[PDB]
């Protein structure tokens, strides 16, 4: 659900996954670049399944480099000798400081990974369950970093002559 556990061994399997993906992308660059251009066109100007994919993770290779920097940050953080607890904003602040990853592209990580796996036509999906777990972590920690808030508006702007107050429960405050 909204919980994710990442073990050191899981991250080792993610590193294996990224190795595989990188070799596949190099092969496709040598054999069939059109598939990559088609994915790019879909991401920047076409069908997805709101906000545009951030320009830092549009191409397959830029996104793979992004995932390597994320993985390396997370591996670094796990070299503790005692329990550590911190807020999502502190984790993201360390991420930005150490490997230059910002919160917004993190939001897109799971979808971008699903697109990349579909584009490389990788048939088996369980093969990449560790990397997907990392992508999910990236999305959850970025999306829900500031927790939730309740906003009560005394009336709806659409119908300003009636008393139709609105309660909003959502992220980002």
């Amino acid at each position: 659900s909204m919980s994710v556990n990442l073990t050191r061994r899981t991250l080792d399997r993610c590193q294996g996954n990224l190795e595989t993906l990188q070799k596949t992308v190099l092969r496709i660059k040598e054999t069939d670049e059109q598939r990559l251009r088609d994915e790019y066109r879909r991401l920047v100007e076409g069908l997805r399944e709101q906000e545009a994919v951030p320009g830092s993770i549009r191409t397959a290779e830029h996104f793979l480099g992004f995932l390597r920097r994320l993985l390396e940050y997370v591996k670094w953080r796990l070299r503790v000798q005692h329990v550590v607890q911190e807020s999502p904003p502190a984790f993201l602040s360390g991420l930005a400081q150490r490997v230059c990853i910002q919160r917004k592209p993190l939001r897109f990580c799971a979808e971008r990974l699903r697109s990349l796996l579909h584009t490389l036509e990788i048939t088996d999906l369980a093969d990449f369950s560790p990397l997907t777990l990392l992508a999910n972590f990236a999305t959850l920690v970025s999306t829900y970093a500031k927790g939730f808030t309740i906003i009560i508006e005394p009336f709806d702007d659409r119908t300003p002559t009636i008393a139709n107050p609105i309660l909003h429960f959502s992220c980002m405050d």
Binding site: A52, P54, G55, S56, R58, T59, E61, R69, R98, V99
Partner: protein
């Protein structure tokens, strides 16, 4: 290239290409800028088209002093 090399190259580039989302009048222009930054980092990291890339960085840095 190691990830450590990629990161140091990226930090150097971002010291020059240091604009944030609120520095662009439109999201489209911001995202194009982000993709341009990726192209520069990739070139410097993989030693590709180095002269034209560092030429580009010098021009950008002069225009954004």
């Amino acid at each position: 290239p190691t990830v450590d090399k990629e990161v140091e190259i990226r930090k150097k580039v971002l010291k020059i290409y240091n604009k944030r989302e609120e520095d662009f009048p439109s999201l489209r222009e911001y995202n194009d800028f982000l993709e341009e930054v990726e192209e520069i980092v990739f070139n410097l990291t993989n030693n590709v088209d180095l002269d034209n890339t560092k030429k580009k960085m010098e021009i950008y840095q002069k225009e954004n002093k």
